[PDB]
Design a protein around this nucleic acid. Sequence first.
RNA 1: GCGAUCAGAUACCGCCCUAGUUCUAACCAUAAACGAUGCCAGCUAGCAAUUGGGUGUAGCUACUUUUAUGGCUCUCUCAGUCGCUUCCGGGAAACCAAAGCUUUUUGGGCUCCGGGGGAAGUAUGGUUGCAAAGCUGAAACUUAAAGGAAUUGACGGAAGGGCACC
Lengths: 129, 82, 120, 84, 218, 227, 107
Amino acid sequence: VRMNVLADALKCINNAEKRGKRQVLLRPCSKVIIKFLTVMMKHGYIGEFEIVDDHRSGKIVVNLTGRLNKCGVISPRFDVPINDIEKWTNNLLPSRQFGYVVLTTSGGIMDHEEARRKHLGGKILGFFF
Amino acid sequence: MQNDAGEFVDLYVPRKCSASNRIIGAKDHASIQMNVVDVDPETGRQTDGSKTYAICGAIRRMGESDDSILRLAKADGIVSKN
Amino acid sequence: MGRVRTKTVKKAAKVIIEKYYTRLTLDFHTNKRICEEVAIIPTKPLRNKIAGYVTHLMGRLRHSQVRGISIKLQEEERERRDNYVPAVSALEQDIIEVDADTKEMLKLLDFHNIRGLQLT
Amino acid sequence: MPLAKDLLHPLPAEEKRKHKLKRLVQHPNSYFMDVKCPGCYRITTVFSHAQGVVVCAGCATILCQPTGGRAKLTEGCSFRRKPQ
Amino acid sequence: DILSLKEDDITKMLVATTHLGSENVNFQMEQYVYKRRADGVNILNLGKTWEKLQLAARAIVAIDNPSDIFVISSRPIGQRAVLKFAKYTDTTPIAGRFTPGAFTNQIQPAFREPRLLVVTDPNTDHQPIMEASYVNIPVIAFTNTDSPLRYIDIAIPCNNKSAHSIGLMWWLLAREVLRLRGTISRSVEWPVVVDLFFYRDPEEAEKEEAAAKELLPP
Amino acid sequence: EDSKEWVPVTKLGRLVREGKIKSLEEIYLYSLPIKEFEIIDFFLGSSLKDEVLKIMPVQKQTRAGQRTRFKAFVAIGDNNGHIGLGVKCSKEVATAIRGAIILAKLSVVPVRRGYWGNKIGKPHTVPCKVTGKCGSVSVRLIPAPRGTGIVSAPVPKKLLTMAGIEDCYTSARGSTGTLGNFAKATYAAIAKTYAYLTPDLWKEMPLGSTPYQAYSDFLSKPTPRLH
Amino acid sequence: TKKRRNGGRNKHNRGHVKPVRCTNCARCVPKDKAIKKFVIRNIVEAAAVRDITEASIWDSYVLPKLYAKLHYCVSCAIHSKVVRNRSREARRIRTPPLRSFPKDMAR
RNA sequence: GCGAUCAGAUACCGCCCUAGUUCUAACCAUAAACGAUGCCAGCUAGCAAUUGGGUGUAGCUACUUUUAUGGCUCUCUCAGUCGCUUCCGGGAAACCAAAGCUUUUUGGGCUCCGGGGGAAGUAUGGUUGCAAAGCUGAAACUUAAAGGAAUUGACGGAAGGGCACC
């Protein structure tokens, strides 16, 4: 069915921005997705997200600036022992300056930049550039 | 695109789309700018000062480019009830 | 019997008509003598053929404007020719004929009453 | 536009056209009615997609016979399209 | 302020059967259609048609050489109209068979550089639109609901099924352009009556002597 | 190295000689379609170096059959921020090379240079990882730290030196004997560096009045001016 | 390579349809893959119609007609020139085209 | 086994016709078992068909005094199988609305299969089978190409036009 729900929504976002389309209907929106999406907001990559209360599993409408080339999702969530943070950022990020790798860390779903400041590594959720 | 002692190097900063925030890419010759002329309030009597909008080939080839002008123009507010 | 005249004859004939149209008549003998003066055609059977194809092109030009050889007096003639039809009438009473749905639109858009009939 | 939102405030006419499950918040087109068979003062609230071959209070008269979208409410029966 | 809709003008549009729309709506033109009539006709928003004629007419101007704005019709119903566009506003003519490359050939004698195109029907006039988008040329067009709006910035929904619609809309752009930096000034109507822009017709033709001597009979 | 008293078919051509444009950069901004080789010859094209990469022959049957035809593959570039590249089919070696230069000038594409993250000493490289594909070959640009000087394959080294991209790593895909496709893939790669919406580009501006419109009156008129 | 998008003929969602034996080879081909042409002819054929009507009592008559829907194998059809080797472009093209009307159906 | 054809016919072709086709109780497990395209979920394009259901039909027709009912169109919508034309992506192209989202050496979940061409679906052993066979499936050794594509020519006892008293 939808084993990882995360990727299904973020693919929808990519496909949408490939039309240029500012809006997407996301299904079936997780907590991990909400935390993924709040992380986007901070760096301005997407405009406002809104989670509708169906008594089912929650859908989201995305408003999109179009600043985003592409958003990818890591499953399996590979265990980062802090010094693979450096390797993972190099491979899939277009620049050393910019583009956030997204983790599920002990203290929250946080970007690798934020994770480095806290010194808390993790399991890898995602990539956003 | 600044270098060391805040001078602006490379060579250019592209014209971005008023509707998609997307870069006009220099050999995308499928790209329109429309310049709609402002009117001297009361009626006709056209005086300069274009309200000018840039639209990418990507909007145009999806057949939506006419519609982008309608929202831009209403935002500048010459057009009403679009 | 067979044939349409080759490109060297025909091309020569199109080029001279564009420039020289005024001074080219339906008459062959004058078209022959203009061609030698205005154009260095080395031999007489070729000269006559070029000049003769001009005669043919001119004959059709007279019989309502011929494509591809516009002297541009012809365009200037269209300006003059422009005939207006008068009276251009919205006919009987207004003329009213409303398709019902467009009447619902009309009242909304326009305070202007303008007579409508929901009409057979 | 191909930047053509506004699904947060989704335009009236279109939403109506689509379907019962294709709404932003998917809301039933399955309403309520009250059925009066005039020999009986009794109102029983029966559905147009009935789910019952509904006998009124004592009288096994009929009321409605199901067809697989909207149950056909049969003959001389009057109903209020409202949650009473 | 009087740049709004004009009641006098809207009657002309009504008589000229502009409100008719091709039965099959096409998604990209759904905004231009208000209502559908019974017997498969679409009602085109007459109020939007005006404002779109006005934007298009404004767009012609601040292209400072008005001559280097190329007015285009393959359709015979627009041929006379496209020619007459040229007579009032300088706007140089492309009538009928557009010779492709008129835009993309330096060697061709039909080497045109438009900073604007105005086009009748994008389905029959596909070639100068394709060619336009090879040379960054703005394209304004007259549009059925069955228009490929691909490569069109600003659409004017006419009816383009022909009759009087193609003629009246074409005039209205030229009219508006002459009020606006043309020196007609103070937008009070027209001494030049709208049926000039129409195809003269009938193909095969009644040969009628111009100079209005109402034909009695032998 | 003209000589040519260039005569301007294009309005664009007029601007060049009248010195009203002075930077092909303006042409790139307003995206104006350079049909004239002539335009390019004045602004740049003085200190554009032309290199002939490949002369490789091809064959075609004029009917019964055998004939042969010439290929020339050309790259043109400043060292500063410009590459145009053109491949042509002709009867002769000379006409092939001259024509390939001509096509190459028309195509001239601007080159985006960025930084490691150290904005010291003028942007040496390319900012991000930009990839372009032409027929199964995809040459993929990776931004590489100074003094790596350019890491590619011998023909793409030339192509990237024509731009003046000091330092890059590259990876190229496929049938590694099919040379022409490798060159074409790099052309797409270098061209796409603008096509990345990097976070520096995010805020529009008031953009531009076009010189086409602005200087318009002069570009439709009269001379054929001396001096 | 799949030249033909339909494989042989129009099999989508059935794949296997009872075969009909080809009236020329007596072969076996599934019903989707027959070239079929509708043979509509008069019993009295052309010249004889003038001769029969005079000879036959009746006020006008109006001739009975023959119907025989023949089923061709692909091999059969192309030999007898029913289908003539089309187009890499024109295999795709459906259309028809007669001009005149009155359908061929000789020998 | 026969008659022609043809050097041969053993074949195409023509005749007689056996096992077989069919059915039943059992085998076999394989086929271009093919839509050459794994399955389940979402998303990314217009139009008209097309299968079925449903919402509206103050639409036509069928009838009871008209109805109520039914079928079809018309309108709207799912889920099916496809087509057309365009990609708005992919591809080497042919093509493909999936062969798209296959990334810039990445994207939901999961299986299976390929990693030069032949030898070879053979050997060998195990397995299954009454048997025929089938599955699982090497290597020695051989060899610089092999395959798919499109392009142009040449060539047809493949197809249509013309042109000349060789």
